[PDB]
């Protein structure tokens, strides 16, 4: 979508929900040229005139979408919207008693409570703005973990001296993700294993079965969410998921092994 | 905001108990110090103690504090401060101490932010009492504009007299009257040719004998040698007109020797002599005696003369005679030996020209330059080709190829001419990709062009009208998918257009543009700025920047797909006219100046124009002035369109009254007030008005003789510091606009109601007309030289751009010759009316200021402004 | 270059101009006599 | 009796003094109507607009244009009819005299001529044409000749505005942009170049528009661009009969009645008027024009 | 989009020029008023084709229903507040329809390029569809070419020219036309509010003691209608003026000055009031006002709130006509009944 409006986000949801009957739908929201989201439960969307921003309600967006959900928000204060969204869904399941209360919706209410989403920060605090960091580091975590992990490791390495470097290193990890033998694919496989062995020993058995034993898309998204949970609180952002992950996500002690792997691969790279 | 603290400043406002300059100054800085304590601004309340401690910064603060206090002060105290300032300006009338600064503050707030209700006559009288002559002049001009009085007129006359403005005083008086009511032989020859005309069989012999005797008495006398040579020129001209081919031999060699001797004597202004010699050699290059004459004159003449008089050599670089060609090749080889950096750009212009004889002749130039410096020409063409491909930006080729095909297909359906247009447009895609932007178009919009190509093939192989219509439908489709986003290229990035220009840095070539006298020093090039700004002139020209070796920036405006070199040839006409005004004592006293910008012909299809620095055009100059008042831009045009729904589609007579209605309803002094607004001070406004008047006068006369028309406020350009006018796009010349179909003109030079209202109260007949007689007399004083200049580029085939085989071109050029001679003499309208200089000035003024002469015009000329 | 320090009030407007003139006249205190007379 | 007016409304409209209100309006929102002329027996309506002369029908109920004819690159200025309506001519910004016919037209010959003329008039012999130019020139043409013509120069390179001609074949009056006019006497046997000038009158000093005179040769009424409508005598003592002013805007072309005693005035003052010249008083005043009115036609 | 065609609007103009029965003389004006709802392209096309002139001349007509219909249509002929966005909002689906029909055209061309003649068959049924699609496309770019020359300024000029010709129907016949006039005036108040706000201060301070425009004529005509002889029209005009009263009661910072000049009712600010005139004069981008009124009365300053653009139940009233019988005579005119 190219800087959309309310009429745009009408078919942005309707045209895909009318073709995905019950399969899950990914909804990415990237708001950074947009003001702060409303505590009352509104999301600002552009107009066609490029002069002011109009509200769109969570009911409006949800009714245009359907019951399965995987939502990724990249806004500033993504937490009033979650508190409100929990309030809206509990109010609609309270109205599910339905004396005369049934709002026409494209998908049944019984599949609303089991659809997943993420958040960007911990509360109404500020995002990251320094030139020493990507401006959309959250989705950098959720689509390219290895490269930004290497860059964050370089910028957090105390041994900055005797290295080949607003300052940002020109580091290039060779290869591609898919091939096993190349270093990039090797790092992808080692990251997948490392982020799975933390989750299996952290989360309970049925939560693990629900998260990492149903489908590959949610599997990969939640595996990158752990690295986000590692890096963002180092820049004061504590994201919130739909089920509450325990605080032992960042304190599980094999990030030493992550540091060892990063050290080894970068020493090999600089030697080569 | 403001507490109750105004009870203490009333005594400092109204005292009326002082009789000393020191006491008045004490009162003034006392009120200035206490003015800050009631200022509503946060940035002014805290500075009260600082101003009390230290005095001098209050002088520069004196505007902000007064502006803060005036708006906050109440209406009943407004007249109190009015009478306080009036009595302050009236007191101590003999010594001007600070009342000039008081009037400066008053005018400073009077600029735009609700001027004080002070009588303008009282302002003028305070200025006169306090010696502010220029402010008094402006005040009295306002008084005269409000109401014309004879006492006011004589006041401005006296003001001009004390300010040494004799032209302004005379014009004001005229407006008031019209509204309110060897050497002996040279002397003998010049008197003889004055009393009796030329073109007989006895006067040329007599003047030849007189010039020969003068040369014998003073063999080293420049005007004698030049006069003998030109006398032989007129004898040869009459012999050619009669035709003999035998009596020209006795005159070609004396003329050549005299011209060589005169050139060697002067070596300063040899432009006309050099071009005359070249025309003589090109007319008769088959005389062996002339061949050895110029061969032995090689040593006598220098190379710096040809260096200064380069361009016509490149213009006539094609030679039909072997001896002429060999002589010119030897001359240009000497030029390459002596500072070749001034001709490499016209050299590859000749390389990329369309004359196969010109490339065959220039192969020798290439070969002789290889033994000197291959790197110069190699880097020159490498940096050139990118600039031509970037001047004609890469979508414009097929854009114009679609447009020119489209309107002639709508006209008369010439499919063969369609195929001729589309044959070379598809060559380079199969030849090979070259640039990143070309790749960006290739991977985006190539398939539709391909499909159109085989639909053209199907039309050729079948003659199918339905598929022709389908091909024109897809042509409309691609025209849409180009023209929508065509105005969205506000800037061009050189890293993606042509990164090799960035790759080639520390360039050793000379900086293109202006040149010095003789052998100019070599200035290298550091790099290029990869960012450009696009101008909207129906062609999208761009702003090119060059980082030179001197650490500064050389900036130009880049034009494409045009043989602009006519502006280059008019540039030396500017050089000649500035030389003549410098030579004239009256023009030198008047300090006339025309600033010609550097402009090099990059190509037959590209060129550079010098953008004048620290200046703004009259087009832009009105926009911010209008939006400061928040009033509509095309206000008068909308007002008359309110009752003229078909202004453009209309006959001759009924446009006049609606135009008059627009003029009567619409005020037309925007430029006149904005020059006062942007003026730093009264003397600043004085120098702006002087520069503005004589610049527009001299430039409009030069345009009148040149035939330069099609002038509009877009190409009209003021100077921000001084106010001189600089024009662009001199393709229209020699009255070429009188022949084109689209609304031929009646006014020679654009002198509109805006210009008349921006003029002083003396009107168009004042200092403007007084400068007019001086310009006309100095231009008539050089009749022969200008004709010798203009005779060269008449019959040549590199000019037919504003007037469009060989005999037809010669006849058209000769009609242009008689037309311009009649235009100079004044007999262009009536044969019996042999009008002199002042009658010509009056006729031109009335014919240019007539409303009917300016109403009937094309909207592209923008006639209302 | 600048004959008088009032020319900078021409191009901008009236309202927001008030702190600008004060600030770009009082950033000149850095020299020694102003620093000595205003501590 | 019916009269019709047009202007900057892009709507031509008829009028009737008996009811005081407009009857029929026809939209022509493609160009500005310069002139219009109604056929003598009230059959077809022609006009001078832009590069097209079209023939409307009066008794039809506002249809599409019944006929249309093109052939002039520049805008057209005036149209000239015939009492037998066999040959229709127009004057445009080219000076090329054309000719067309009613009742299933074919393509006839077209005559090319320089000096783009302004107004034309057909002599009652229906074989001779006089055109006026804006350089003080009069072009005389006839169907008998092929390329020869006659040159008359009342003024030297001066913008002769228009002309008027006597239906009884006696007088020919001129109109100059400086307010000047010439009267030419031409007696019987009109098929000759014997236009004898008589006098010259400077009626005004500003720009002027078309002069019309009645069929009975006893008046000469002009109207100028200074809110002036001035009628003089042409056969009795040769003096000013009546001047008329008071119009809000400058008066455009005028028309007469059949009895040579009533005249209409159409101007750009969003109104049109009808006066009795004997009483020099308001007889009728029609309004409803949102914009100005430039051209008018009337017949009885 | 589907209904607006130039042939239809030209036939409508012909019918409203000369059709006998007043029912169509009603419904044609209603159809143009509905077509002028919010469509700047339609407003430009109708202005150019001159339906505005015909509908302006149809103000003077015998029956009052068509006069009220004409005022309803010129109520709809207000130019548009969200114009700079509705023009793009229409450009997008013209682009999309052009692309979709173009793709369908080449799809049908590829279908017809099946190397089968099929004489007197689907191909013969397809060529007429081919140039029908071509005609629809050509109509699409005709409207597309008319889009870019929109000229909101000329639209506003024609609106302000229509208002002054609406004005002389103040001395009309029925209270129906008077009510339609007061709701039209209320909508003018709703749209061009600030002109009313700047003129009311000057007018009532002069009553205590810039004007001169055609706007002052409408401002006075509202007060003229405020003394209507009918029942409902009086309180309707009072509720129209009540928005003005409530607005200048405060006008943010102006409430103090308004109260100060309000104490005179029983018995710097000049520049502040003058500054607001240019704020809309710039946004703009014969005149016989004649101000005649028997001022024998003065304005002393059922729904509780007030929506400023008033409703107009005339469309529902005209629609309710189509429920009374038409093939059979109604009650009280039967060959026998109570009223008979």
Numbering used by the authors:
A (entry chain G): 148 to 312, 333 to 439
B (entry chain H): 1217 to 1397, 1716 to 1777, 1813 to 2373, 2414 to 2474
C (entry chain H): 901 to 939
D (entry chain I): 3 to 302
E (entry chain A): 732 to 940, 959 to 1016, 1069 to 1086, 1095 to 1110, 1132 to 1170
What does the paper say about this structure?
Target of rapamycin complex 1 (TORC1) is a protein kinase controlling cell homeostasis and growth in response to nutrients and stresses. In Saccharomyces cerevisiae, glucose depletion triggers a redistribution of TORC1 from a dispersed localization over the vacuole surface into a large, inactive condensate called TOROID (TORC1 organized in inhibited domains). The 3.9-Å-resolution structure of TORC1 from TOROID cryo-EM data together with interrogation of key interactions in vivo provide structural insights into TORC1-TORC1′ and TORC1-EGOC interaction interfaces. These data support a model in which glucose-dependent activation of EGOC triggers binding to TORC1 at an interface required for TOROID assembly, preventing TORC1 polymerization and promoting release of active TORC1.
To better understand the molecular regulation of TOROID (dis)assembly, we purified TORC1 from KOG1-TAP ∆tor1 cells grown PDS and acquired a high-resolution TOROID structure by cryo-EM. Using these particles for 3D reconstruction 45 resulted in a 3.87-Å map (FSC = 0.143), which enabled us to build a nearly complete structural model of yeast TORC1 in the TOROID. Moreover, the 3D reconstruction and local resolution estimation showed that the interactions between adjacent TORC1 units along the TOROID helix (intracoil) were more prominent than interactions along the helix z direction (intercoil), consistent with the resolution difference at the intracoil and intercoil interfaces. The overall yeast TORC1 structure extracted from TOROIDs was very similar to its mammalian counterpart (mTORC1). Tor2 in TOROIDs is structurally more like mTOR in nonactivated-state mTORC1 (r.m.s.d.inactive = 3.3 Å) than in Rheb-bound mTORC1 (r.m.s.d.active = 10.4 Å). Indeed, TORC1 in TOROIDs had an even more ‘open’ conformation than nonactivated-state human mTORC1: the HORN region of Tor2 made 10° and 24° outward shifts compared with nonactivated-state and Rheb-bound mTORC1, respectively. The Twix region is situated between α-helices 26 and 29 of Kog1 and interacts with the FRB′ domain of Tor2′ in an adjacent TORC1′ in the TOROID. In this vicinity, the structure displays several prominent molecular interactions leading to a robust TORC1-TORC1′ binding interface that we term the hub of interactions. This hub is centered around Trp2207, which sits between Arg884, Lys885 and Arg888 of Kog1, forming a prominent cation-pi interaction with Arg884 situated near the tip of the Tack α-helix and the base of the Twix region.
